[PDB]
Design a protein around this ligand. Structure first.
Ligand code: MG
Ligand code: MG
Ligand code: MG
Ligand code: MG
Ligand code: MG
Ligand code: MG
Ligand code: MG
Ligand code: MG
Ligand code: MG
Ligand code: MG
Ligand code: MG
Ligand code: MG
Ligand code: MG
Ligand code: MG
Ligand code: MG
Ligand code: MG
Ligand code: MG
Ligand code: MG
Ligand code: MG
Ligand code: MG
Lengths: 77, 136, 94, 116, 58
RNA sequence: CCGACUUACCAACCCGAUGCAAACUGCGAAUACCGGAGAAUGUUAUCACGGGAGACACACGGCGGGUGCUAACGUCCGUCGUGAAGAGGGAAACAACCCAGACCGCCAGCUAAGGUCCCAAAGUCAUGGUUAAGUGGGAAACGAUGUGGGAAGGCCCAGAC
RNA sequence: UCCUCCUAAAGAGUAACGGAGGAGCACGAAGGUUGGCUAAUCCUGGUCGGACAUCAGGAGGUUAGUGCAAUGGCAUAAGCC
RNA sequence: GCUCAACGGAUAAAAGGUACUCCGGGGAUAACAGGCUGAUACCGCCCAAGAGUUCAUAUCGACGGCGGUGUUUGGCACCU
RNA sequence: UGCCUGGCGGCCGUAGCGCGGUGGUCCCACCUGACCCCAUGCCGAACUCAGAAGUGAAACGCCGUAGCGCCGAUGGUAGUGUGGGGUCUCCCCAUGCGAGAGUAGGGAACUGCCAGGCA
């Protein structure tokens, strides 16, 4: 009772371009909080761990790695 | 009266009670009191139904209680309007689904347990039945 | 010693098994590793009574499917949550 | 493990050259021999490899596994690589400190036309 | 190849917005309306989606 | 003094078994959403720019919930439907529930929900069972040789109740 | 007014005087880069020294750590020199 | 250069009494009564530890459970 | 062409842990010495240099082993989209999707490009 009723604005995170979509260079793919999806081929990683395209093509999600970590990669097709 | 000590969160959502129970077998003991209905069964109806059957078997035999409340149920006071915060916790209930084996006991002849479990089933809101250990 | 008659199941699923269990029959399967599993249907009242014997879970039973006899052992069982009934019996090809 | 620490010492440097897509010249060093091979950006197939275990290199060398022997194989890998048209490589380290035999392995190869 | 006849037997008053578009895809307009469509794994997927309003004399 | 004998005791960590969790997850659907291709259907149903508005008091019902007492024709959200702004038939009467969306006329026919003994249109219809209570045509724990069906069990013509 | 989790119904968003906690800063290194390193907690042995200081081996493995609340993350360390 | 923190910030600059009161509106919103609900209250029942010298049910009845009426204190704000 | 050893990957526990055995011609590891290039918030222990006396003990690779880790059916169960129904704070019917846990079982990897030794 009382001493509550506070919350913050939703940050609108999540995947913006799902698999198989054609992106242009520099377009945000996922907005993250940690690094849930790591940077694969032809994608970057901003200071918020935002994954952005680096050369236009089709997005592709992968599970490469000894630790089974999700990698987002782009094929220039 | 059964009640958790040092629980993570003081007040809990109401939630719903759908499905069939998990502990449907007599494992620790030999004869059990299996629930047939549905509905929350509080912490005083457990002790009131326990004394009734640790006394109908004198004091001999083992008795197992296979439920625990761990669910705080609040209650708004009297003459208080609605809103202005969730009410304070008053008692603890254990959600029961049809199939839960509530009590079981061992070390007694069957006809003594079948009567002791009858004097405990009269203190419980939900319907109950007498079930016996099976080979599986 | 118990010999139980059974028949193969024409259709399988959820609505095709609750349809059986409303006709006093319940499904069961026989699997033995090196052979294809055999899903069968069999009566309820004739096997719920016979399971009351403690020996049902210790000896090598016999199932008569399409004339031939299969020697099996009761591996597992599923019971109704609050009724003296059955839902499934797992038979291993002993 | 004295080798698992080294293999995880060079992982960050190794995995950047996979991301850059640049041909790398990995180096392996032992208390007796020293190897050096050129590995394509693919990372699964090699192009040029020179080492101190070959009879055509160790036969005119006093002792394999010292600075002047490293300069003998650093010269070799640079001639083979330039012969097939590879000129722009990057130097891997494999966890060895760039101070001793590896430095002379890199310095000699650098002096023979290789660019890194 | 072989055409298929679909007739609507129920109203589309309170149906979900997805079942109102499926009728538009099939081309049915009112109760008792009959249309002759081409048989196809995509057309037969329309019928299954609204297989409580339409009745097919295949 | 060391502990030297002891204790009808409490008891952490682990081991086997049994449960619970919106703020637990070594698992994990159905749907929903995003993108690509392809038929068919729809008077472009889509988007962009411009002229004119109204509206920002919503209600009930189904499903997922928070609050409440899993109380309210209570209150706050998500999605669908209806009323608002929709007449007609049904639920006796009954904005919201079920069927169904009225351009006009006809002393023409077929149906939906719901019904066919009279009020009041249509089966005092056909075959087989159940109920003796006016149950049908309000309500629980619990109690009982009411009655139909089913699988077994015990004793019994060396004679059972 | 701002931040974090749940309610929020597995894309985004989503209310109540619903359930729980925080902020109005810090840092000239606590930033850049290069080189190097791996924790908690238990066992044994040991001088003061004890259940817990420091030392040596073993298990364990990130159950530690992150300037500050919570969530996501982190070994190629985003943790420690 | 602003706890313009009432934090999209009415002024650089601001508290109260009115039962002596007044105007425009609202059953969009309270007091009375009605309405829906029945937490609470009143009435009844179920199991029976026990009291009753013996003896649970002559009379009461613990720890618990299930309902009825719409008589109380309330909840909601549908009518005025 | 086969066997063994070294480097770099694909692949990620059916691939890892434990237990037993086995390998030194070459490769590898331990190893000798340290004034020197270089380093210890002390210590050549680690890093580094100069080499070969010795060993395969430790480590590593290889072979066997299920004692763990791990993978995992078929059948049934739960849940759920759409449409109906009930004595509708919970369920049933038609139809489509269909887990989790568990059972039978599988299992101590597979593979590519180079460079050495041996046959
Ligand atoms: Mg407004
Ligand atoms: Mg509003
Ligand atoms: Mg609203
Ligand atoms: Mg309302
Ligand atoms: Mg109407
Ligand atoms: Mg009427
Ligand atoms: Mg019209
Ligand atoms: Mg008539
Ligand atoms: Mg009546
Ligand atoms: Mg969301
Ligand atoms: Mg959603
Ligand atoms: Mg920092
Ligand atoms: Mg670094
Ligand atoms: Mg840093
Ligand atoms: Mg404001
Ligand atoms: Mg203002
Ligand atoms: Mg006066
Ligand atoms: Mg006035
Ligand atoms: Mg009003
Ligand atoms: Mg209102």
């Amino acid at each position: 009772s009382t001493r509550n009723g506070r919350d913050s604005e939703a940050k609108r995170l999540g995947v913006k371009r799902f698999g198989g979509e054609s992106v242009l260079a520099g377009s945000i793919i996922v907005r993250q909080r940690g690094t849930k999806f790591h940077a694969g081929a032809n994608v970057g990683c901003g200071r918020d761990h935002t994954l952005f395209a680096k050369a236009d093509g089709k997005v592709k999600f992968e599970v490469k790695g000894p630790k089974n970590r999700k990698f987002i990669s782009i094929e220039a097709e | 009266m059964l009640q958790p000590k040092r629980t993570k969160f003081r007040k809990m959502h109401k939630g719903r009670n759908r499905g069939l129970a998990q502990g449907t077998d007599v494992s620790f003991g030999s004869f059990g009191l299996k629930a047939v209905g549905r509905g929350r069964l509080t912490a005083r109806q457990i002790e009131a139904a326990r004394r009734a059957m640790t006394r109908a078997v004198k004091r001999q035999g083992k008795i197992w209680i296979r439920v625990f409340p761990d669910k705080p149920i609040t209650e708004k006071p009297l003459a208080v309007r609605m809103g202005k915060g969730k009410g304070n916790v008053e008692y603890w209930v254990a959600l029961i689904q049809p199939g839960k084996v509530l009590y079981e006991m061992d070390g007694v002849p069957e006809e003594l347990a079948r009567e002791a479990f009858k004097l405990a089933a009269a203190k419980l809101p939900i319907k109950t039945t007498f079930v016996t250990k099976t080979v599986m | 010693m118990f010999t139980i008659n059974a028949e193969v199941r024409k259709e399988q699923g959820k609505g095709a098994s609750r349809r059986l269990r409303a006709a006093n029959k319940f499904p069961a399967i026989i699997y033995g590793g090196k052979e294809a599993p055999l899903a069968i249907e069999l009566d309820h009242d004739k096997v719920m009574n016979m399971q009351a014997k403690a020996e049902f879970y210790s000896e090598v039973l016999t199932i008569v499917v399409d004339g031939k006899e299969i020697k099996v052992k009761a591996q597992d069982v599923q019971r109704h949550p609050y009724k003296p009934k059955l839902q499934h019996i797992d038979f291993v090809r002993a | 493990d004295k080798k698992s620490a080294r293999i995880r010492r060079a992982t960050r440097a190794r995995r950047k050259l996979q991301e850059l897509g640049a041909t790398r010249l990995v180096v392996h060093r032992t208390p007796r021999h020293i190897y050096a091979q050129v590995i394509a950006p693919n990372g699964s197939e090699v192009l040029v490899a020179a080492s101190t275990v070959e009879k055509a290199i160790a036969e005119q060398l006093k002792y394999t596994g010292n600075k002047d022997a490293a300069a003998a194989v650093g010269k070799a890998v640079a001639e083979r690589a330039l012969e097939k048209g590879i000129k722009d490589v990057s130097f891997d380290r494999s966890g060895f400190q760039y101070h001793g035999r590896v430095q002379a392995l890199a310095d000699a190869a650098r002096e023979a036309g290789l660019q890194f | 190849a072989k055409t298929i006849k679909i007739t609507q037997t129920r109203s589309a008053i309170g149906r979900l917005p997805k079942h109102k578009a499926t009728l538009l895809g099939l081309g049915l307009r009112r109760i008792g309306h009959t249309v002759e469509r081409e048989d196809t794994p995509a057309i037969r997927g329309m019928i299954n989606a609204v297989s409580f309003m339409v009745k097919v004399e295949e």
